[PDB]
Amino acid sequence: TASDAAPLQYLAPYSGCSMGEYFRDNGKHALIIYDDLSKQAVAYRQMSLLLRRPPGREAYPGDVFYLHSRLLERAAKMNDAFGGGSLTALPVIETQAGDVSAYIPTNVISITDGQIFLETELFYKGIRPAINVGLSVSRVGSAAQTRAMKQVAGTMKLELAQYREVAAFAQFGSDLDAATQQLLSRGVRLTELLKQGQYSPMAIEEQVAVIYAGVRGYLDKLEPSKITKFENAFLSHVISQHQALLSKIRTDGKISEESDAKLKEIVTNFLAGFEA
Amino acid sequence: TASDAAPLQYLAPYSGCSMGEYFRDNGKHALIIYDDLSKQAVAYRQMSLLLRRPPGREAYPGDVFYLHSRLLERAAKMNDAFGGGSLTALPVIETQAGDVSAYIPTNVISITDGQIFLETELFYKGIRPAINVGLSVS
Amino acid sequence: TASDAAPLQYLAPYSGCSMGEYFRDNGKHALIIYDDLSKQAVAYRQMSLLLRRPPGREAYPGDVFYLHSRLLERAAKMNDAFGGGSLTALPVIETQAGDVSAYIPTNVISITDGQIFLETELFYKGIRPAINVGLSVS
Amino acid sequence: VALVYGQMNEPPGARARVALTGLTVAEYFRDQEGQDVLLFIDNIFRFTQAGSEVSALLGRIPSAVGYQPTLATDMGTMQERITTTKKGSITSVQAIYVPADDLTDPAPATTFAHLDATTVLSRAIAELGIYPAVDPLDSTSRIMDPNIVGSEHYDVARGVQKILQDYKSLQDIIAILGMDELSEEDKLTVSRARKIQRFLSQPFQVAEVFTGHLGKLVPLKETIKGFQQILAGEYDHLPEQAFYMVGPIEEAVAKADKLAE
Amino acid sequence: VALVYGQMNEPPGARARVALTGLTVAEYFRDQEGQDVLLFIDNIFRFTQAGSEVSALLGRIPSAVGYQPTLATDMGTMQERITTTKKGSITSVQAIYVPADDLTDPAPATTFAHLDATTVLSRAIAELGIYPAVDPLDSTSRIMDPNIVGSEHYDVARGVQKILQDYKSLQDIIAILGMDELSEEDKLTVSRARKIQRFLSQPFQVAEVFTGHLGKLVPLKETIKGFQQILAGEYDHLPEQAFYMVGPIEEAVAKADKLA
Amino acid sequence: VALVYGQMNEPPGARARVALTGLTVAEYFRDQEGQDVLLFIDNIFRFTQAGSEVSALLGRIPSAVGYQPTLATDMGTMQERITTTKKGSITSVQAIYVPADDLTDPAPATTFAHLDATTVLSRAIAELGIYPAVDPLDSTSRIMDPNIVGSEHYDVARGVQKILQDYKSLQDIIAILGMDELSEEDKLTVSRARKIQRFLSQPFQVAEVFTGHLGKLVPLKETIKGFQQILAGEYDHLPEQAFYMVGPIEEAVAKADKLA
Amino acid sequence: ATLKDITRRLKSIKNIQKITKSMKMVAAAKYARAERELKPARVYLCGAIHSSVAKQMKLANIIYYSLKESTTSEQSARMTAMDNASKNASEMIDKLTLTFNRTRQAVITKELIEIISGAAAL
């Protein structure tokens, strides 16, 4: 913390890394969150300059890139020959006025496999979590999604990208064709489905059930203002009454033609209930 | 003035201040205009760099705030116990491209008891004095 | 060229100039083409930062205008009493994004006796030479 | 109330320490007496400017923006004492100067992490005559949680912020393209936003010399409700001006009449 | 292929030199065996950055934007070893990262001083299913000069692009006002353009283990003819999909047959 | 005329002192002969630049933008001798080169305070074809006082600036949307402003080879007048082009006939 | 200029350019419809429309005429007008970006030069 000498703030991430390596190496899986790499960079810069090493841009030492790369590379997926164990790392970087190109944000972006970009404008507009879906990325991609998710994730990703093309028009769309007027609607509902309260992470099966609902078109006639309420209650319902379908989805790992049909009815009857 | 040595330009404000305190400390009233505190800062900056004191933000000494705070704190209203005299100061600062957020401009705006901000836009427009109502305060 | 030490890139234009000067000095007429003064300027700046001279606008050393004025002052038209000879210089300067206000371009415009500005727009649109007839001058 | 002072007429040194003296007095009542302390510091930036002023004479290569290389740690070992413990409680209100108005300046920037609630004031708001000039979209509190203030409190707050954000985005655009083309749906949020923008101002009891208005103190429920109604469309008839420099929503209604002529 | 690696954990000096090491290797297949080697530097920006780190460490004053004082020489001493000598030639495909999307940033700006062509891969094109997903209007080359590729080559190329450009124009119209105020003329530019767009796609032998399709290595001659004729109007009767993922025009013809 | 020169080809020290030298010559006529002098200097910015050239060599920590910490005092003890006194008069005209066009540059920035009148030239205006390219809202003169130029002069002067200032704020919108959406009233300022802007230009003998027109010299009362009328709406019927490149207003009316 | 100032305009002129562009596609649409409906009727921010009539300003059979015409001309006018407005917004988004990057760069160099200047005076 804040009052601990620079060197301890400097070290912290490595000493935490080692701890996570014990799991990685032993066929076990470990997750590590560095919060933040921005403050540690500062700690390091402070010692560098006090030891009088040469300062480069932003007063950072020439080896600041090497401080993080040697840290973030220790995260990896081993081979069975080595135990198949892993170390995933979620490093946090604090940008300034959204300057993702400032020095440290540039290094770390350049080192990692993807970025989840959060934005104030989004946050205050009601999108929480504030993920900017267009600029966020996952180099690993689907190589890491489940077949269940992919079954849905894929068309969602696509209507959203499509909405993003037209979104700006909405607010002045004094007379748009029903083609694009369609994408605006899918656009705002899909967006409302991505919203989420905190401290309540969902089970992959619950996420696909809800995503399926709007992606399939079921909430298209529903009011944007209600999707948050719909999902909540809809999900409360299937987590209550339908734990056998979710268990299927879960197990079968995908949405069978059957479970597909069962969901159709579950949502078309719940929706009816819903707008009574 | 312009050809006087940097140290004279630097001192000038403190000199003039002291002549104003005579009135302030003797139950009389004085008004001092520091025209301007921008050129003094430059003088200070010059004197200071030539002494080999490491330059700071914008090339000025790390203590330019202090340079002006020390001076302007002297303008004051004494109680009857001290004569009830006073010293009122009207320091001038020159902005560039009407940018009042600038470091020096704000350094000095954060010492005085208000500011009168004049804009060239208002001036050309016919509004003279070019006082900017919104940005000036007391 | 691109692979010779900066000092050689820096030097190159002065040497060529001296060769053009023989002709100028003997009633003859030479033409010198400096391509480009942009890169000579960065070669000289590499030298200057390595010698530790204070970097200024765009990190260029304070004397880069003179790097160029000295060179281009040597192009000249002598009168009969000195041979009538002459040296004509067509120095080249590379702007970024058509920005003709940059430090180096401006420097050089303030030395030569006109410019020939070629525009990228013109070039694609099929007008070549991509000369900008309103902006260019002699 | 005990008072400790190291003003602007002092040498850097005094300025680099008064906060310590002040804070030390406060820690006594927290620990040795176990009481509930209220700590006011105006302005903590001065502690950091003090240090930057002697820094070069201490022989240090400057960090960015002229600051000393030990800014954050210097701030850390201090800010970490200004805190509530199990022994006593401190409620610190620290004024934080923002050089050149730039919130990213290493100092203001480095201080956010030490706070649980932040009130960001803006000259752009002040310039319009809206006091207190708090920026509604740049101010935050760690208790703005439905689990802590309640959903009515929470939905209103966020409701007010969405509309001000929604209006911020349109501002630059109706600026040029004008307002006709806007959807009645969107020219109502321009309305409500402009009224909220005002309903957020308030005549302070310590600024009558400034506003020429009697200071009003509004109770938490009068606030939540007033905004709830503006957001609800319950005053789309009153004029914006009726909402400027008033306490509770009823004064906005009364002021409408007074303005009614 | 020989692979030379300078991983991100390596110190500045290592990521600094590894592109030279790779260079060394390639120079052999040219100066010792006089081949036409291919050099791939991925990515050219990290080369430059490694340069700055090393520079800063040696305590030299950075220049504009924080790069090294020797940015231009560090680059030149390497780029220049990549050429066609009498013995053979090294050709380099360099992956470029543009900082801040700023093409006038010193890193990128310096780099273009040496480039003779750009290959712009485009996500948009990919979305058309078109692959390779190269952008026919954004990708460029210094040697696209009739004085270098010859008038024929030069004209076909300039023919392909204009048509592709024109169609781009119409693209806006089509979607809004609907595809028909379109002239006997405007309807042909589209048709052909759409045939062209496809004829520009192609099956790679590298992706055979996967596309279940046979890779094609079309020859330059075949390339110019192909497009020549489409421009010409020789296959206006052929249908679009006849041209998707094929090699030489001959295949466009035969695919049409199997497509009745 | 006495001529003193230390040009672009001299080493820094020469350029750093020739001003002093021309200056001294002038001081002699002023004080030793009580003479009315005229002192032309091209360019006084070069003296300061010269100073910046040697300053590192003198071993000084640089001030902002790499200039010498003694910039102002150096300008000062030099500028302060270029002045009229009780003994003699010195009318001095000094050209001040502005680097990169930046008037916030320490050199030019520090020079404003030494003048009584300033003529700030603009690339933007020059590029519009208006010569001299003087910025009307940026040039000033301590004589622009009603009690010195008379109120007639003082009111036309402030009249012209007010309309150009007004035109200036409309420009942002004119820029995306043109004039259509403009108020009938606003469009009249625009018309008048564009006619005042053109009438401010004029052919110089010295620039005849470039204007293609004969140089003109307009008498003050002709200027005060011509501008009154324009302001007063006495020429709202003439076209802008009538006012471009002319002397007296009477010539602007004529040009209008010729334009037919 | 301030990167934050420049990013405001850019932020907004980028929007104005997409709005404006959208308004033309609409204006073209209606104008398609109109040129057709116009055909028959003769056998019986909109540019300088409302003003042109306004200045020169100081049944049914013909009412539907002046109407059926005044809408082709209008939807024509809005169309071109919004066509050039985004043409203007684009020259600006390209113009401002250059000012943004000159400043962006300049700000970084200016700072470093300040640091280097102070370090070197020790």
Swiss-Prot record, chain A:
Belongs to the ATPase alpha/beta chains family. The gene is ATP5F1A. Disulfide bonds: none annotated. The modification N6-succinyllysine is found at K28, K150, K221, K229, K254, K262. ATP binds at Q196, Q198. The siderophore enterobactin (Ent) produced by enteric bacteria binds Fe(3+) and helps bacteria scavenge iron ions from the environment. As a consequence, the mammalian siderocalin LCN2 plays an important role in defense against bacterial infections by sequestering iron bound to microbial siderophores. LCN2 can also bind iron bound to endogenous or nutrient-derived iron chelators and plays an important role in cellular iron homeostasis. It is found in: Mitochondrion inner membrane; Cell membrane. The record marks S136 as: Required for activity. This is ATP synthase F(1) complex subunit alpha, mitochondrial. It comes from Bos taurus. The chain holds residues 278 to 553 of 553 of the full protein.
UniProtKB/Swiss-Prot annotation, chain D:
The modification Phosphoserine is found at S151, S169. It comes from Bos taurus (Bovine). The modification N6-acetyllysine is found at K162, K216, K221, K258. One of its GO terms (molecular function) is ATP binding. The modification Phosphothreonine is found at T48. The chain holds residues 265 to 525 of 528 of the full protein. GO terms for biological process: proton motive force-driven ATP synthesis; proton motive force-driven mitochondrial ATP synthesis. It comes from the Eukaryota. Keywords: Acetylation, ATP synthesis, ATP-binding, CF(1), Glycoprotein, Hydrogen ion transport, Ion transport, Magnesium, Membrane, Metal-binding, Mitochondrion, Mitochondrion inner membrane, Nucleotide-binding, Phosphoprotein, Transit peptide, Translocase, Transport. The gene is ATP5F1B. This is ATP synthase F(1) complex catalytic subunit beta, mitochondrial. The lineage of its organism: Eukaryota, Metazoa, Chordata, Craniata, Vertebrata.
Swiss-Prot record, chain G:
The modification N6-succinyllysine is found at K24, K58, K95. It holds the Pfam family ATP-synt. The modification N6-acetyllysine is found at K14, K30, K58. It comes from the Eukaryota. It is found in: Mitochondrion inner membrane. Belongs to the ATPase gamma chain family. PANTHER family: ATP SYNTHASE GAMMA CHAIN, ATP SYNTHASE SUBUNIT GAMMA, MITOCHONDRIAL. Subunit gamma, of the mitochondrial membrane ATP synthase complex (F(1)F(0) ATP synthase or Complex V) that produces ATP from ADP in the presence of a proton gradient across the membrane which is generated by electron transport complexes of the respiratory chain. ATP synthase complex consist of a soluble F(1) head domain - the catalytic core - and a membrane F(1) domain - the membrane proton channel. These two domains are linked by a central stalk rotating inside the F(1) region and a stationary peripheral stalk. NCBIfam families: ATPsyn_F1gamma (TIGR01146). Component of the ATP synthase complex composed at least of ATP5F1A/subunit alpha, ATP5F1B/subunit beta, ATP5MC1/subunit c (homooctomer), MT-ATP6/subunit a, MT-ATP8/subunit 8, ATP5ME/subunit e, ATP5MF/subunit f, ATP5MG/subunit g, ATP5MK/subunit k, ATP5MJ/subunit j, ATP5F1C/subunit gamma, ATP5F1D/subunit delta, ATP5F1E/subunit epsilon, ATP5PF/subunit F6, ATP5PB/subunit b, ATP5PD/subunit d, ATP5PO/subunit OSCP. This is ATP synthase F(1) complex subunit gamma, mitochondrial. It comes from Bos taurus (Bovine).
